[PDB]
Amino acid sequence: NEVFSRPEWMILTCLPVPPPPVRPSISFNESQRGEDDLTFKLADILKANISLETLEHNGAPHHAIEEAESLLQFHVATYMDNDIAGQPQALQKSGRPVKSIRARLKGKEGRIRGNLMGKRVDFSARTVISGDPNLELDQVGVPKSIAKTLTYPEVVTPYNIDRLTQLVRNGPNEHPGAKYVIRDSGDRIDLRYSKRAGDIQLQYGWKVERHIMDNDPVLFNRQPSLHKMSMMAHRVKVIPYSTFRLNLSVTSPYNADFDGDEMNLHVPQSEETRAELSQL
């Protein structure tokens, strides 16, 4: 394409250098410092470059230049891809091969399969499941500790204002309590440490990050997840003891038993998201 991809652009003449975010560094203790494999591979490209530049500038010995060119060719090439068929791998002192860019995107656990198409998440919780003849089909027994950690951001409104103020007063340690207060201003109030955690006076529009409570809709899931029924919306039921309790008849869709199975819990953060769960 004459605009976006002329064939002349396939060959590399100039090299875009990625910024630190793409190749982070870490400064440990003044005699320990960690650089990313790319920063290594780049330095080789550079060194090989600086070398070949000096050779061309000086008396070009033809065959000592093309010798230095196919070194540069290697470093640049091995930087984008280190798993090249026929070629030797660029290795990093310890004997391990350099993590090329290709290789960061490639596999499951790559940037695609493992950071975009699936990623770990916050408002998640996991524990051993156990059955209960006294839970209703659609509910899920949630351990007090798990309820006390997972939070729902509720907007201060005339309807909830008084209730919310009470959970705020209750605080992070009591069971129907709250963890944070989010002001209009954007800054987060930590009820655990704020000197004003007592005398906290709410304003319509603020958000109270309150504990997960009985009858909140939550996504319950048993992995693998080869089913839409492997992830279903349940009513919370805060209970004692460290296990997620489920109604026995709901065992089959998840494909769960109580021989040591664990299950995942995800908490929606929006009125919209909650509706999605409860309604679909």
Partner 1 sequence: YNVRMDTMANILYYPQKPLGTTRAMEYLKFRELPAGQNAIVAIACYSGYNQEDSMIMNQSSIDRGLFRSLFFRSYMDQEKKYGMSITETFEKPQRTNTLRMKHGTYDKLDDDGLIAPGVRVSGEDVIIGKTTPISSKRDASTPLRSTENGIVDQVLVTTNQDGLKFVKVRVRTTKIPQIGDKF
Partner 2 sequence: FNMKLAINAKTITSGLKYALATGNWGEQKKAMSSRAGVSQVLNRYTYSSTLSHLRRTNTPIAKPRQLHNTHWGLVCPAETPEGQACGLVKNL
Partner 3 sequence: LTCPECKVYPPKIVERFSEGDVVCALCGLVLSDKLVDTRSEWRTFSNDDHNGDDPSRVGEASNPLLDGNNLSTRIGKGETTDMRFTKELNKAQGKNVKDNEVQAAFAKITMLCDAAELPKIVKDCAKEAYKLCHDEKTLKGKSMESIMAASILIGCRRAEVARTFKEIQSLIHVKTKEFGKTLNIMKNI
Q: Is 172 in the site for partner 1 (CB under 8 A)?
A: no
For partner 2, the closer CB: 92 or 165? 92
Binder of Mg ion out of 30, 122, 199, 259 (CB under 5 A): 259
Report the distance separating Cα 142 and Cα 200, nearest Å.
29
For partner 2, the closer CB: 70 or 89? 89
For Mg ion, the closer CB: 184 or 257? 257
- Binding residue count for partner 3, defined by CB under 8 A: 61
Residue type, 35: E
Closest C-alpha among 172, 26, 40 to residue 94: 40
Residues that bind partner 2 (CB under 8 A): 94-96
Report the distance separating Cα 178 and Cα 172, nearest Å.
5
Backbone angles phi, psi at 58, to 5 degrees: -70, -170
**Tokens representing 232?**
């279903």
Q: Which residues contact 169 (CB under 8 A, 6 or more apart)?
A: 198, 200
42-101 residues in contact with partner 3 (CB under 8 A) are: 42-44, 47-48, 51, 64, 67-68, 70-71, 74, 82-99
For partner 3, the closer CB: 8 or 187? 187
Using CB under 5 A as the criterion, what x/- string covers residues 238-257 for binding Mg ion? -------------------x
Q: Is 127 in the site for partner 1 (CB under 8 A)?
A: yes
* Residue environment code for 248-279, b if the CB has 16+ CB neighbours within 10 A, otherwise e: eebbeebebeeeebebbbbbbeeeeebeebee
Q: How far is CA 118 from the centre of its chain?
A: 9
Residues within the interface to partner 1 (CB under 8 A): 29-32, 127-128, 130-133, 241-243, 248, 251, 256-260
Residues within the interface to partner 3 (CB under 8 A): 24, 26, 28, 30-37, 39-44, 47-48, 51, 64, 67-68, 70-71, 74, 82-99, 104, 107, 109-110, 114, 180, 187-197
